[PDB]
Amino acid sequence: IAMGEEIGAEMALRTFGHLLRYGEPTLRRAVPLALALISVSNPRLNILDTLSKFSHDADPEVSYNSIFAMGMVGSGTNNARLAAMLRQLAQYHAKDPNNLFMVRLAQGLTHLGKGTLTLCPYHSDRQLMSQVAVAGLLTVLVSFLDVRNIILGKSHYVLYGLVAAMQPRMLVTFDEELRPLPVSVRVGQAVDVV
Amino acid sequence: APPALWDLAADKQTLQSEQPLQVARCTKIINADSEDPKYIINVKQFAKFVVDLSDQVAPTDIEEGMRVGVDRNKYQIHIPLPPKIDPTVTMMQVEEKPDVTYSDVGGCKEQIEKLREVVETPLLHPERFVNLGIEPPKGVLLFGPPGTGKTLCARAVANRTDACFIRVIGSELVQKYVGEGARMVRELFEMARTKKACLIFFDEIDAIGGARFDDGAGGDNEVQRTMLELINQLDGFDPRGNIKVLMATNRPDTLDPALMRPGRLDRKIEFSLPDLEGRTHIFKIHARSMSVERDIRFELLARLCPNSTGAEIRSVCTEAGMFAIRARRKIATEKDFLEAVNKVIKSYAKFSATPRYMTYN
Amino acid sequence: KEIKEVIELPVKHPELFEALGIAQPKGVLLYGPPGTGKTLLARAVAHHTDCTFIRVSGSELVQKFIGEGARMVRELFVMAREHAPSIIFMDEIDSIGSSRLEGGSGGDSEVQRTMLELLNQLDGFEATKNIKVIMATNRIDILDSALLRPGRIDRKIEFPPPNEEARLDILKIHSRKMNLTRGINLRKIAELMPGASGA
Amino acid sequence: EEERSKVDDLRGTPMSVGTLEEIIDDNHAIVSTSVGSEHYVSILSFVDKDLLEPGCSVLLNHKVHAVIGVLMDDTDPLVTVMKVEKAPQETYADIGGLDNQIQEIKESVELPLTHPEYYEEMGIKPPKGVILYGPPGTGKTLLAKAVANQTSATFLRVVGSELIQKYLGDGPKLVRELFRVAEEHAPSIVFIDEIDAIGTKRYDSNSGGEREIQRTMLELLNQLDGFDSRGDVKVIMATNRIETLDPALIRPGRIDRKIEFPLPDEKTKKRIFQIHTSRMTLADDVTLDDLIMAKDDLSGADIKAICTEAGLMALRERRMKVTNEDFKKSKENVLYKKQEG
Amino acid sequence: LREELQLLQEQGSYVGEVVRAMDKKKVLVKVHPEGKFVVDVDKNIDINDV
Amino acid sequence: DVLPPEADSSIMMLTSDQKPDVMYADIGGMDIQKQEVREAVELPLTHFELYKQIGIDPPRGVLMYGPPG
Numbered sequence A: 001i002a003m004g005e006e007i008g009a010e011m012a013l014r015t016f017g018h019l020l021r022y023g024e025p026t027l028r029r030a031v032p033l034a035l036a037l038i039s040v041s042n043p044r045l046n047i048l049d050t051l052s053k054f055s056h057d058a059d060p061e062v063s064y065n066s067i068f069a070m071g072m073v074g075s076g077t078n079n080a081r082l083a084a085m086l087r088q089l090a091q092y093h094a095k096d097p098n099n100l101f102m103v104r105l106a107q108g109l110t111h112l113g114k115g116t117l118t119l120c121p122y123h124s125d126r127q128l129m130s131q132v133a134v135a136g137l138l139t140v141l142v143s144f145l146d147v148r149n150i151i152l153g154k155s156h157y158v159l160y161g162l163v164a165a166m167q168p169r170m171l172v173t174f175d176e177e178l179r180p181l182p183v184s185v186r187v188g189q190a191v192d193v194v
Numbered sequence B: 001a002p003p004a005l006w007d008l009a010a011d012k013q014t015l016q017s018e019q020p021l022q023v024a025r026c027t028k029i030i031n032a033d034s035e036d037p038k039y040i041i042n043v044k045q046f047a048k049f050v051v052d053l054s055d056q057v058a059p060t061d062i063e064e065g066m067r068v069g070v071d072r073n074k075y076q077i078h079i080p081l082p083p084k085i086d087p088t089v090t091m092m093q094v095e096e097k098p099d100v101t102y103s104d105v106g107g108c109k110e111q112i113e114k115l116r117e118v119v120e121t122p123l124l125h126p127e128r129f130v131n132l133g134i135e136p137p138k139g140v141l142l143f144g145p146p147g148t149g150k151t152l153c154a155r156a157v158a159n160r161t162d163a164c165f166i167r168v169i170g171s172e173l174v175q176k177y178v179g180e181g182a183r184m185v186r187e188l189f190e191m192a193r194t195k196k197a198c199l200i201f202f203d204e205i206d207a208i209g210g211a212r213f214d215d216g217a218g219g220d221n222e223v224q225r226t227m228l229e230l231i232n233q234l235d236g237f238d239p240r241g242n243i244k245v246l247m248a249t250n251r252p253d254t255l256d257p258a259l260m261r262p263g264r265l266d267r268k269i270e271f272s273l274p275d276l277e278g279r280t281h282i283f284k285i286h287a288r289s290m291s292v293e294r295d296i297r298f299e300l301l302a303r304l305c306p307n308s309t310g311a312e313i314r315s316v317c318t319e320a321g322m323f324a325i326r327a328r329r330k331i332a333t334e335k336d337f338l339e340a341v342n343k344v345i346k347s348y349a350k351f352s353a354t355p356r357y358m359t360y361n
Numbered sequence C: 001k002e003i004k005e006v007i008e009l010p011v012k013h014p015e016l017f018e019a020l021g022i023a024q025p026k027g028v029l030l031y032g033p034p035g036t037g038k039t040l041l042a043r044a045v046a047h048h049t050d051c052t053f054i055r056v057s058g059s060e061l062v063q064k065f066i067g068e069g070a071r072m073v074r075e076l077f078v079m080a081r082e083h084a085p086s087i088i089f090m091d092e093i094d095s096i097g098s099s100r101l102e103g104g105s106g107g108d109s110e111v112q113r114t115m116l117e118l119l120n121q122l123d124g125f126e127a128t129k130n131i132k133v134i135m136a137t138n139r140i141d142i143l144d145s146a147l148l149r150p151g152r153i154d155r156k157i158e159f160p161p162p163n164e165e166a167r168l169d170i171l172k173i174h175s176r177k178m179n180l181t182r183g184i185n186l187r188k189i190a191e192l193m194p195g196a197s198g199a
Numbered sequence D: 001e002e003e004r005s006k007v008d009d010l011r012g013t014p015m016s017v018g019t020l021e022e023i024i025d026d027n028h029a030i031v032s033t034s035v036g037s038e039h040y041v042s043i044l045s046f047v048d049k050d051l052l053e054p055g056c057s058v059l060l061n062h063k064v065h066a067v068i069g070v071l072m073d074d075t076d077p078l079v080t081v082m083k084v085e086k087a088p089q090e091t092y093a094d095i096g097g098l099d100n101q102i103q104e105i106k107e108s109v110e111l112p113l114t115h116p117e118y119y120e121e122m123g124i125k126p127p128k129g130v131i132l133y134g135p136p137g138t139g140k141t142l143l144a145k146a147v148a149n150q151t152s153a154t155f156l157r158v159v160g161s162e163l164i165q166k167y168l169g170d171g172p173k174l175v176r177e178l179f180r181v182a183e184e185h186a187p188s189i190v191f192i193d194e195i196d197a198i199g200t201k202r203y204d205s206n207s208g209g210e211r212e213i214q215r216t217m218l219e220l221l222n223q224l225d226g227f228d229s230r231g232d233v234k235v236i237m238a239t240n241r242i243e244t245l246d247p248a249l250i251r252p253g254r255i256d257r258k259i260e261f262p263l264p265d266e267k268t269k270k271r272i273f274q275i276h277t278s279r280m281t282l283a284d285d286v287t288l289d290d291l292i293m294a295k296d297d298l299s300g301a302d303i304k305a306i307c308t309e310a311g312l313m314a315l316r317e318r319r320m321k322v323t324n325e326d327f328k329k330s331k332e333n334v335l336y337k338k339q340e341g
Numbered sequence E: 001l002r003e004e005l006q007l008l009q010e011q012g013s014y015v016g017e018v019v020r021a022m023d024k025k026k027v028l029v030k031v032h033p034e035g036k037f038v039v040d041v042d043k044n045i046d047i048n049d050v
Numbered sequence F: 001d002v003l004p005p006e007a008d009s010s011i012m013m014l015t016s017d018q019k020p021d022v023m024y025a026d027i028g029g030m031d032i033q034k035q036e037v038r039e040a041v042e043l044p045l046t047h048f049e050l051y052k053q054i055g056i057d058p059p060r061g062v063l064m065y066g067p068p069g
């Protein structure tokens, strides 16, 4: 349903909804993964609405794939509901990379290759990464996220956009976005190339 | 499902624990006890029985006209149950949870403090009246514009330190089937006494306290009960009410509880109401809101707004953000809304002066 | 020659309603003497089309018999969802006696509102076609209908006083079952009854 | 799996319908159900023992009367009067020239739900609702605004306090549930059309006196006041007579908005008229301007309904086309409708 | 006759009205002189038949 | 099985042969009020056939009102 259907209008809500409601258990983990294609139309209404109830789930796998399904398709446009949602996300006591993968990847939805001069100031992101790195204390994953937000934050130089406005799809991301769905050790590293 | 799986597991122990105590039906009030062995009990099933007890129940621990459990075969005495009435209109009227604490005050200092010394100051230390007491006073009086009514109760909601007190909605007191709420106001106080001094507040006490009368024909007659019925609830010696009371209204009438309050209650105080000063706090309720432009001034707007209450002038600072988002203005300058303020005051004072002075006069 | 276009075109035609481009007529009334046949016209045209027929309150005990308590007009509005096309009627409030100028106003106000909130639940929102309402009065409230009618929303038709035309045949209509010879004069039997009523 | 084939015998063979009433705080739930039969249920499954709550219904065993399951049953007049659904096809592009009026309420219809950010980026919290009014009879032109609001969230329109005036209170209570079932449907929108409370005087059926009708409106706001309700249900309210309402309704809410409806001007009538006759084909001599140019102080309903008279005779001849020779002459009937009627 | 005359006393018989049906196969029906019940299939007539 | 039917249950009827009875002929002021009861009682009961012949159906409508008198 993800790749086999590409059109301007969604029209896939009936089948995408039918497979999750009629599907067997544990399949709902990989269901939201179709959001990287058909959600390029109007992700503001559908994505944060749906994934809001699944973002509070205690299962780390569905939580990993929820913030992941939002991912890049929802990082093109900003909003205050996202910035106000960032609260209480990093205050959870849950271990494992899923917590800092939920929060830090959600930080990347504010803008893509925009700033900082022109436009948004970088001091706010520096204060956020400085205050969030004081916990645990290491937990070197905080040294993973403080470089992570500045990956797309401080690189810039590339407008995407989507990729792409001409409607090619990035052939690295998807492939790389597939493997960590079970990320154990090194596979999420090959996805860092992004 | 692991909740649901463990959920159907112990029905075995529930069905084994089912046979004992299951026949405890029906909830039944007793009538009289002539001597040691004998009792007579009365139910609403129409069943009335003069019948004995189960040995687990002692005679002196039980009260007359008391809802009890029974095994209707022997018609024993299983256990007495304290509660009687009332249904969820109570649980609607009875309220819990905190919110809206002190700091939401719009700058009124000793207007709320004169009534802060009446309620939570004695509730902070009921021991305070051991040495000096005498008494925590009987009741109060409150009325004025809307601003700010029932939020002082909300102020008491968050700052309540003991037990969740009970709001009272007016139009549920007036009812069909004469004497419906008559039971309530009577019986809910024991339900409030069940909470051992947990306070009560009545809203729309002017509507439900209706006074006084016309020759014919009521109409008010059945409601003429409730007022004097509350006065009977006032004339009940005990406690009264261990909850004190807090009462907010609009007009000086109704007179009968207002002329009964010098016969019982105390502490007649008043809104607050607008002031030349406190508007700056009602304009500082927006202080930490938005980000105040460095050149935005309070006194400039505060001196321009007479008889402001708190209501509109809270939206007065808010209608900047109205035209802000509409005109794309990133933040607002005081000149922006004060253009629409002198509008919104006049435009809304053209038809309505909201004569609060006239309401109670 | 008027009401028929109000009724059958929503039953037969409607695909050509949009050809003209206007929606269903919201209602209609016949005002005049109270008066005869307007209620027949109601149920007969309901029978002419076979579309089911409904009335207004209704006492006393047709109310809680549907539901428990409410605005109470929604359940009646739900009745028409079960059966369409349907005909709803105001029974009767055709009279000069219910006025009182106040005490009958509010009694009529919700009888007036029974069309209004229905017109507001017909045209205002919900759906769709085939539902109609009928009114009847003489005077007074007919001018009070203009208070409800700055054009919104109804059809205005007058209920005629009787005349010799019907008097001949409508008696002949009643004369079908009775035993009478043919030599009866229709002239004098008609013309001896000026005014009076349809009753 | 096996639990389904286990407790079905405890359930079995049948099970009754009880009425959930009260609880012993040990979670032995005392119920009054026909006829006034109690029980004590602490049972482990399907509960959610808390939220089933007093003042509800239950389903009881025969031996002995344990509630093994519960339902939410309506139907009822409660849910029926709020819905369904609808979203009729009309839009806010239908009424032009008054955009100054709707562009005001644009942010009021937009900012809740859609485009919420700059509400909370300003953080000034303007969720105060709206009030409406205007001459002479308007508010369906505001339904032309309300028919557009159906693009977002969910909506209910109510008419008057009539459900209270039908009988001695009864309180607000039917308004209470309509108010707190909008919390069940929250977020939503609710509107009451043309408040007649003390505007109209006499009542249908039995009612009185003034104060009980005065307080059921006074409780209408005081419940909406409220203590202390965040629930929206963004409240839209209207009456075409600003007089009779108690002026205290404005300050708690809606404070900021009561829409003034201007009467149509010459070009507004021009802007409005062609939207109707767009579908109805005019004849050669038919002109929008001259007729409404000479006519004065019309209504949008009339200028919409003036086309219906030609929808008679031309449809009596069964013609798809309007004729101004009739539309002039037939306009006299609607002119007679406004003049003499 | 005697068997149905034997069947019908130990139970009786009545006539119900279905106000709803259940996913569990049960059905919401009233005992009209008294309070309501909720009872199950009843395997001849299915849920979708009524 | 059903009843014959029936001996029925309550009252029933008589009240004339078992009394009371009062002569109406004393009061003649109601003659025009009896004019209805005149045509609306005797022949409606004793003739159902005449109502097929006339073409008019016999009404069940009768009213009384006013007391006192």
Ligand SMILES: Nc1ncnc2c1ncn2[C@@H]1O[C@H](COP(=O)(O)OP(=O)(O)O)[C@@H](O)[C@H]1O
Pocket: B104, B105, B106, B107, B108, B145, B146, B147, B148, B149, B150, B151, B282, B309, B310, B311, B314, D225, D226, D251, D252
């Ligand atoms: N000093 C104050 N502090 C906080 N809020 C105030 C103050 N004065 C007025 N208000 C505002 O006025 C309004 C009072 O409205 P309302 O609760 O309807 O009053 P009442 O309950 O007396 O009718 C509230 O919205 C409140 O925010």
Ligand SMILES: Nc1ncnc2c1ncn2[C@@H]1O[C@H](COP(=O)(O)OP(=O)(O)O)[C@@H](O)[C@H]1O
Pocket: C034, C035, C036, C037, C038, C039, C040, C041, C092, C094, C162, C166, C170, C197, C198, C199
């Ligand atoms: N055009 C008519 N001429 C003569 N009699 C009529 C005519 N229309 C109706 N009637 C008679 O009048 C009676 C009652 O009319 P109806 O429509 O019930 O008026 P209402 O509803 O005011 O009682 C009908 O039974 C019919 O026989």
Ligand SMILES: Nc1ncnc2c1ncn2[C@@H]1O[C@H](COP(=O)(O)OP(=O)(O)O)[C@@H](O)[C@H]1O
Pocket: C152, D094, D095, D096, D137, D138, D139, D140, D141, D142, D143, D144, D271, D272, D275, D299, D300, D301, D302, D304
């Ligand atoms: N631009 C427009 N296009 C179409 N119709 C319009 C326009 N402007 C106003 N109207 C009509 O004017 C009418 C006035 O209705 P209104 O007086 O609000 O009725 P109500 O009594 O329901 O409040 C509306 O029904 C609307 O259809």
